[PDB]
Amino acid sequence: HTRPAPAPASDAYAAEVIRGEAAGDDWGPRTKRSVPDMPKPNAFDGRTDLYAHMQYRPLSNGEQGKYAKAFDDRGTRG
Amino acid sequence: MREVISIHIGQAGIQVGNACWELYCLEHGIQPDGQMPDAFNTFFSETGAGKHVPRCIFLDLEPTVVDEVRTGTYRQLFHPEQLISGKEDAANNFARGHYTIGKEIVDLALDRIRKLADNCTGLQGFLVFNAVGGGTGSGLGSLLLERLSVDYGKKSKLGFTVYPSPQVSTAVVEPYNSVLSTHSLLEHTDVAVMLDNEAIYDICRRSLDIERPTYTNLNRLIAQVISSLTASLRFDGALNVDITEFQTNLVPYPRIHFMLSSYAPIISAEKAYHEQLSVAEITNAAFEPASMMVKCDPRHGKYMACCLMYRGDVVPKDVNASVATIKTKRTIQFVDWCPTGFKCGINYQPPTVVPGGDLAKVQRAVCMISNSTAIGEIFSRLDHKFDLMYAKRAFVHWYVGEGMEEGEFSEAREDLAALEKDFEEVGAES
Amino acid sequence: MREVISIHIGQAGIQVGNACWELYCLEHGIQPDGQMPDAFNTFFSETGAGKHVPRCIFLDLEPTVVDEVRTGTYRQLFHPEQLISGKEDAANNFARGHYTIGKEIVDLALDRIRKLADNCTGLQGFLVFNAVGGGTGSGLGSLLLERLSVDYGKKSKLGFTVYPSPQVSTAVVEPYNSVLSTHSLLEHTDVAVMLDNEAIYDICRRSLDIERPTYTNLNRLIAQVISSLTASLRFDGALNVDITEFQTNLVPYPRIHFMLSSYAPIISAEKAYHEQLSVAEITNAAFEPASMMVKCDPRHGKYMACCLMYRGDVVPKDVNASVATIKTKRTIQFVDWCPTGFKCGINYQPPTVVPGGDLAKVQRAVCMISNSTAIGEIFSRLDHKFDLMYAKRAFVHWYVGEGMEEGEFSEAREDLAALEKDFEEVGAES
Amino acid sequence: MREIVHIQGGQCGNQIGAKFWEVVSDEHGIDPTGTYHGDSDLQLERINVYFNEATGGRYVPRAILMDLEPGTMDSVRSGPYGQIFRPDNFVFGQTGAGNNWAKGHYTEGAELIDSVLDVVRKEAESCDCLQGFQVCHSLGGGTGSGMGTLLISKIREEYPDRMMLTFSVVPSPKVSDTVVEPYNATLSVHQLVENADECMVLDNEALYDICFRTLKLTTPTFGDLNHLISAVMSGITCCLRFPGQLNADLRKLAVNLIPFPRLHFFMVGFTPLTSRGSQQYRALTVPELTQQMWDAKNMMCAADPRHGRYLTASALFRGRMSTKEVDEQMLNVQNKNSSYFVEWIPNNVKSSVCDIPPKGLKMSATFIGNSTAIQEMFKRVSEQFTAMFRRKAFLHWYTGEGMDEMEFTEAESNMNDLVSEYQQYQD
Amino acid sequence: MREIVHIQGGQCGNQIGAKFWEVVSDEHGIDPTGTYHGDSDLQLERINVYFNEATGGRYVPRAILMDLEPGTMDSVRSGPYGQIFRPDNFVFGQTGAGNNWAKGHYTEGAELIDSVLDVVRKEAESCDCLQGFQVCHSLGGGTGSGMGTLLISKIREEYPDRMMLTFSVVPSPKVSDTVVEPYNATLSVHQLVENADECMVLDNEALYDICFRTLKLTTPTFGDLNHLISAVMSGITCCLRFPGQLNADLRKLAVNLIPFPRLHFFMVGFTPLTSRGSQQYRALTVPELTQQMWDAKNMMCAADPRHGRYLTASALFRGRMSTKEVDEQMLNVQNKNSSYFVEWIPNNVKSSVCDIPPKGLKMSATFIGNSTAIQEMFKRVSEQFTAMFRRKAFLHWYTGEGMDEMEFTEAESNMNDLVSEYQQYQD
Numbered sequence A: 001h002t003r004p005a006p007a008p009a010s011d012a013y014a015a016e017v018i019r020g021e022a023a024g025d026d027w028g029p030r031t032k033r034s035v036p037d038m039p040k041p042n043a044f045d046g047r048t049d050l051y052a053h054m055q056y057r058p059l060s061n062g063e064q065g066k067y068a069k070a071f072d073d074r075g076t077r078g
Numbered sequence B, C: 001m002r003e004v005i006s007i008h009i010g011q012a013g014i015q016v017g018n019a020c021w022e023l024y025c026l027e028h029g030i031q032p033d034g035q036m037p038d039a040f041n042t043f044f045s046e047t048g049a050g051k052h053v054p055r056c057i058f059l060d061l062e063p064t065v066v067d068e069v070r071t072g073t074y075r076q077l078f079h080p081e082q083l084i085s086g087k088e089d090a091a092n093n094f095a096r097g098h099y100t101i102g103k104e105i106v107d108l109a110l111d112r113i114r115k116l117a118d119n120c121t122g123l124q125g126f127l128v129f130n131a132v133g134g135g136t137g138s139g140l141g142s143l144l145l146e147r148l149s150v151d152y153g154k155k156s157k158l159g160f161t162v163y164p165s166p167q168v169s170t171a172v173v174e175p176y177n178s179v180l181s182t183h184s185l186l187e188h189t190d191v192a193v194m195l196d197n198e199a200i201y202d203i204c205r206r207s208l209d210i211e212r213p214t215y216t217n218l219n220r221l222i223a224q225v226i227s228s229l230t231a232s233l234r235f236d237g238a239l240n241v242d243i244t245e246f247q248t249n250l251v252p253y254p255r256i257h258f259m260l261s262s263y264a265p266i267i268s269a270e271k272a273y274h275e276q277l278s279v280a281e282i283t284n285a286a287f288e289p290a291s292m293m294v295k296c297d298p299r300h301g302k303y304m305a306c307c308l309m310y311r312g313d314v315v316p317k318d319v320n321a322s323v324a325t326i327k328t329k330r331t332i333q334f335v336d337w338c339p340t341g342f343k344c345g346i347n348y349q350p351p352t353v354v355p356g357g358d359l360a361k362v363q364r365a366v367c368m369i370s371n372s373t374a375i376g377e378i379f380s381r382l383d384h385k386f387d388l389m390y391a392k393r394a395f396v397h398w399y400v401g402e403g404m405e406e407g408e409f410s411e412a413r414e415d416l417a418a419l420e421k422d423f424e425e426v427g428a429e430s
Numbered sequence D, E: 001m002r003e004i005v006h007i008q009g010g011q012c013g014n015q016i017g018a019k020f021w022e023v024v025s026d027e028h029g030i031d032p033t034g035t036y037h038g039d040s041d042l043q044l045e046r047i048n049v050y051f052n053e054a055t056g057g058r059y060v061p062r063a064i065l066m067d068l069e070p071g072t073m074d075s076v077r078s079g080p081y082g083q084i085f086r087p088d089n090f091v092f093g094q095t096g097a098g099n100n101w102a103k104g105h106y107t108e109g110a111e112l113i114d115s116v117l118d119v120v121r122k123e124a125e126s127c128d129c130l131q132g133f134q135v136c137h138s139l140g141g142g143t144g145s146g147m148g149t150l151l152i153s154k155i156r157e158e159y160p161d162r163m164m165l166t167f168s169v170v171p172s173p174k175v176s177d178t179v180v181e182p183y184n185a186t187l188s189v190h191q192l193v194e195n196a197d198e199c200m201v202l203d204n205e206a207l208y209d210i211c212f213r214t215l216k217l218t219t220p221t222f223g224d225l226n227h228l229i230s231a232v233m234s235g236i237t238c239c240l241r242f243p244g245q246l247n248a249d250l251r252k253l254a255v256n257l258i259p260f261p262r263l264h265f266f267m268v269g270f271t272p273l274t275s276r277g278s279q280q281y282r283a284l285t286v287p288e289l290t291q292q293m294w295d296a297k298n299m300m301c302a303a304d305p306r307h308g309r310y311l312t313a314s315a316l317f318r319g320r321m322s323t324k325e326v327d328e329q330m331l332n333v334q335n336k337n338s339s340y341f342v343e344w345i346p347n348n349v350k351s352s353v354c355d356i357p358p359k360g361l362k363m364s365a366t367f368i369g370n371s372t373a374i375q376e377m378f379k380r381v382s383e384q385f386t387a388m389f390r391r392k393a394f395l396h397w398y399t400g401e402g403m404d405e406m407e408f409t410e411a412e413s414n415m416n417d418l419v420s421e422y423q424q425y426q427d
């Protein structure tokens, strides 16, 4: 009838781990923060990827005028 | 059923035991009157309904300190006749405490021990708290140690003796009484856990950040060690280490049985909010020389065998990771013939905090109780005081009158000289 | 987890450190009490629940610069044992900080560095902040740096030291105290970043249009340079630069390891609106000698290895084009044997602005730390200042009487005389 | 219809079997109340292997609990799945052995050995046909080591025609847990090599490194270790409890794993160990269980199997699998690396197939291997004893309780014979 | 049923494969959660070249991401399409090689090589037919070049009959990123000749230029640059993943593009690179994919191919195309400019057509060119190495981890030897 003392209360539960009943996430905390909006969406249409060039998607009518007016991705020089 | 009885002789013995049962009554939640509103079975006797009495005896030849226990805050908790008084003190003389006036009072102490052991089912060990520097603790303590050895034979006994420090000490005949006590401890006491006052003064100065430490502050955190070294019986954990384990694992030789002490997390209220107290950090603090309770350098000696008890939420693996980091450090050393040198004990109940105490609530605690060959140095300095002093036959007229003989200082001198021969020989490699 | 330990030594060290850790707690959102309402592991040590402890110590023999930290707005931040004080200062004497009063406190200095190093999991380097003018920063820094190479071998040690300006200096034995410091920071410190108070006086004069700069304003942008130096660990970017990456890129020879420092955008709150801050503008601004943080002219010497650490909205192409425009300029001349002088690092965190500060919020910032042969002008001038004062034995009996001998002036002079020979020999074109 | 007598000794084996009967009861599908509620009729077919019937649907396991301190008995009783145990099988003392081999064997063990042999013989007589004697204890302590080796010495004298698996955790070389471990280790194995027919030696450092490097578990407890040894221990007798395409009992293990009577030392392992978040990336197929089967990291022993040639091997496969596919990595691991196997034994590997997998897993396997790498496990204990007995330390706790130093020299006589014979066949 | 195992090192290697496995994934129609939701049956036919099938439809690549810092994998932990990887295949360091080739190779290199090769060996035995091993790393760095080039030498020892694709980026001639850039490059090419079987040469300055004059982009990030590199790496093994009228696997290019075993440094190219402004006006037919194939502006290497002769060239066409228009256009470029091709080899051009184009593009083609103009790149790095070594600058670091100047003189000897045989064949 020894006095109960609290367990270390780890999240381990190796029985549950080896049975795979609870998935969880084994990965630790992500280091080196998480910078918001870097690299920035470019001006003169918002380009965060090269998917348009590498997928050959057709130009939208609301964005065709920008390339009608300008040559490079620098915006509205004239 | 685990059960340990403790005896308290000498002015050090009662005043340490005042704080010992102050923490003991707090772990089990019992109010100081003696009512709990079965880990209490190993320290308290369940008496009828709602009444509990501690299974310890207080005894002192001086009638002073017993009365302030009898008229203090623990008048109802203790048993009124377990408190043992005396007509007068032994007065810093080992002769008076062992022969003349302790003899009329040792037999009233012996029967109440028999009353305590008959009440319990299974006893585990003997705890003695005393000081060899005075008359009452060294005299009646040795006088009781003769009687309990022949009556309750071969039972494990663990002793806590407050030895003189090399620097701070409060009696002139103090080196006489320590030498005469050591002739009784070596052949009778199984494992003697050493203590020293100014090391605990030093651990209050730099750790607890109090610049005015007193005897109350020292004895308050001595009780933390005593509860920690008996924490396996009370509360459950990973590796239970009882008193029977402690002797048979830690004493290698019959005449080599002395012991150090440590208690690493000793942190005030303001200091606790900034310390990251992990198992790895608290292990490193215990083995450092600044945190021990006797001023001896373990670098000067070599460790013989070590035992560690962990309290609180300690997972059983970083204790083994800390041991590997301990043994790979060169600044700590072991004797060459002892490859396996650590005993691990884990308990899950964290140490309680006394109200008004300077110790803060810490979730992890370790006590390092280790044999060492550096205990020769604290015996060489104390013997160096005796040899320079006995050359002039000083202070002997107090001793030879009360039953002692003049030659008895010589056998006690060579007994300590034989001990110094043992400590230097066993620390030598081959 | 990566971690770097910063030791703050001498009067300059704490006053930088108050500015340094103020910039650090605003980046991670930690309030001055220590509570954040995953990247703090570089500098802050997580303890308990919602408490962060700076991984730094304040070591100074004069207590009146440390006690204002202990009673200011950062009481709950620091661990009180990290703040190490002393009875009396070294009083700008190298012999006091190294021999008489230095050895009495450096034992307690290693006691907490070991505590900080044990709490660290993965260590990459050390930061040291000192001023060679004053004997606490000069002598005790020399004692601590010599001991740390023995205690922690082969680890990085970042030297953020402050040197006397040519025209400006606020002490008399500064030529004496700087030369004796160069015997230790040569052979122990692996990366040393010179700073100079009058160059930052000039930087605050024109770029920040402050007519009356103070010691608070200088140390605030000292904090900007060091935070930009180690922002690669805390945040993610295109090209990370680690501490040991920083050390092998800019130290071609084990003694040629002194490097310059330049933070390019210093703009006011009212000039920020009118400046078009791009990566081409700031990169040309950094190489300007007006933005140079040490009073030396880089046109006399040769640039030998440079690193450019970018913070904020720096896209990787035009920064690679910005370096090309620097190389085409004949004014910025590199050494002949190094056709690859540039190291580049880009972090995505814009620099934080302290509330009530003087710097303006900018979206782009670059910090250049460059090794040059124009730093020989710093050493040779301080060599001339020492040689003139030593020739008639001025201020020697203060230094000799506190433990030293005359022979340590000849060895330190000869060691510094080798540096001027080494700088000329390395930078010579073949 | 064959049954196993389980013995638990000391504070280790009581806690080992507390987690071991947790798995076996859950694999057989009985609740903490004791009634059966499993959904498989095949699950209830072989219950006499590990449990006995009782009136009212209760099932009481046939195992004993044995120690000298009632504190550890409070741990197994109050823990989960502790109410099923037989109260009559709770044989215990009051003194406590106190990490001494002499106490549990000669002086204060004698008043409890006669009590438990009366208890042990009760289920020995009540059960119909004995198959073996499983024990689980330690060798570093004194409560289960010194007392356990006397009981295993006493039980073979009465019943000399049965096999006996032993699961003894040996002291680790890297970490010290008791100062007098090389005393109790050498004296316990001195009794076993003359008596123990086969033995599964384990240690604490291997279960740590398994639960760090493979399970990727941050701060685990001993309950995590005691489950993994239970995963092995249930896997040893998988062919008895469940039918299969090729069944192999304890004697099938013995006949294919001990070429010589004195070479009876094995090493164990549990194959399908995956991390907390890596179970969705694995492919539960027979090529990769064998990949984890023969890895040195996966074994539960301090020995490195690449150091010593395997004298023989075993396989306990459970689940639905192709016996051709089972046979083809087992042939592949003979041929890809034949330099790490013995030459004068063809068909070095024994295999078995059980048709029922463990709970929560589609497939599992258990490896048992007699190797000359246990040579390295005894060399550390032999180095510890020889380098320390020369100064006759710690003997007063031993020589004062009944045995002489001549027994310690006899422990040097045969342990040096064990290390001689294992290296001999390596050449 | 041939397989490719992908291994990557350093800052540069891991960021490419974050985009490379991203580009492969949506070609095969599998989500970042790993499930397949593609609309074409032809995608699932050849998945095993790049992915392990798992329980529940999960697909995990043969990706082994190697680094000495946790920073790179942290980007892979949180980047898009970074959850598809096997968590066990993230071998990591803690110290970091610190941009030192000596630290990644010799001293600190040995502590992780025995662990990273264990992950490689587990994946190598799982798949049946290994076409080869594909690595993507840097050369001027120290973490992916120092540790990577030792890893290539080790894996050629264990698997000597399997090919080796290396996609190693090169120090730029115009600009520089690190200071020990020529030191770490010459020590790696000295090893890359002996172990690796074929090399694709990349550099950021050509990737920067190809994003300006061909794509009309004035703000190219690295993620923009990694996409054009990832299009090349998909084009090499487009024959394995998809059918075609004429099939050319990895080993067919090896016998084509490598006349002698040390001439395995090639230059790459991707054909349908159209800016968004001029996207509509260009047509997609084989003659205008060829005219952008052979342009010196389209080459992703420093070397101008107009300077040196083409020893052998290869083309990896993708799409529904006429076989004549593939044949006649690559025949016209052998007649219009025959001074740029080697006379003593007839028909320097290898051509192959796969009927499955990439996503969205009607047609695509990838160019691999074994030009002798690559000696201009190797001369400049050897020029910088001799300039810094003769002063022995930045050498006290490399000699600190256990190097002497013998292999530094050997590295320049082999560098000067391999550039000597390029110019001997140009005459």
Ligand SMILES: Nc1nc2c(ncn2[C@@H]2O[C@H](COP(=O)(O)OP(=O)(O)OP(=O)(O)O)[C@@H](O)[C@H]2O)c(=O)[nH]1
Residues within 6 Å of the ligand: B009, B010, B011, B012, B013, B015, B016, B062, B089, B090, B091, B092, B093, B131, B132, B133, B134, B135, B136, B137, B138, B162, B169, B170, B171, B197, B215, B216, B218, B219
């Ligand atoms: N740590 C600690 N030591 C104590 C305490 N009380 C007394 N001592 C020690 O005891 C020594 C004196 O020896 P004692 O045997 O206790 O004196 P005594 O019990 O009064 O015996 P007599 O002097 O003969 O009457 C002092 O030097 C103290 O160091 C205490 O409360 N705490």
Ligand SMILES: Nc1nc2c(ncn2[C@@H]2O[C@H](COP(=O)(O)OP(=O)(O)OP(=O)(O)O)[C@@H](O)[C@H]2O)c(=O)[nH]1
Residues within 6 Å of the ligand: C009, C010, C011, C012, C015, C016, C061, C062, C089, C090, C091, C092, C093, C130, C131, C132, C133, C134, C135, C136, C137, C138, C162, C169, C170, C171, C197, C215, C216, C218, C219
């Ligand atoms: N930039 C900067 N320099 C400072 C600051 N405080 C002191 N210094 C420099 O330090 C020099 C004086 O030497 P110190 O090292 O500070 O003297 P100390 O640290 O008090 O040493 P002791 O007097 O022996 O205690 C001056 O010449 C200043 O240039 C500061 O807050 N900022």
Ligand SMILES: Nc1nc2c(ncn2[C@@H]2O[C@H](COP(=O)(O)OP(=O)(O)O)[C@@H](O)[C@H]2O)c(=O)[nH]1
Residues within 6 Å of the ligand: D009, D010, D011, D012, D013, D015, D016, D097, D098, D099, D138, D139, D140, D141, D142, D143, D144, D145, D146, D169, D171, D177, D178, D204, D207, D222, D225, D226
């Ligand atoms: N794996 C495991 N090992 C244990 C457990 N309990 C104790 N041990 C090991 O047993 C050793 C101590 O011996 P002990 O169990 O006290 O033996 P006893 O005195 O005969 O009971 C230590 O090395 C522990 O590692 C447990 O629950 N699990």
Ligand SMILES: Nc1nc2c(ncn2[C@@H]2O[C@H](COP(=O)(O)OP(=O)(O)O)[C@@H](O)[C@H]2O)c(=O)[nH]1
Residues within 6 Å of the ligand: C238, C239, E009, E010, E011, E012, E015, E016, E099, E138, E139, E140, E141, E142, E143, E144, E145, E169, E170, E171, E172, E177, E178, E204, E222, E223, E225, E226
């Ligand atoms: N394409 C590309 N190249 C990169 C990237 N990051 C770094 N590099 C190149 O890598 C070279 C430096 O090597 P480094 O990253 O230090 O190699 P490591 O030490 O192994 O990590 C430089 O020349 C860069 O151009 C990236 O994200 N994309």
Ligand SMILES: [Mg+2]
Residues within 6 Å of the ligand: B010, B011, B060, B061, B062, B089, B090, B136
């Ligand atoms: Mg008294």
Ligand SMILES: [Mg+2]
Residues within 6 Å of the ligand: C011, C062, C089, C090, C134, C136
């Ligand atoms: Mg001062």
Ligand SMILES: [Mg+2]
Residues within 6 Å of the ligand: E247, E248
């Ligand atoms: Mg073919």
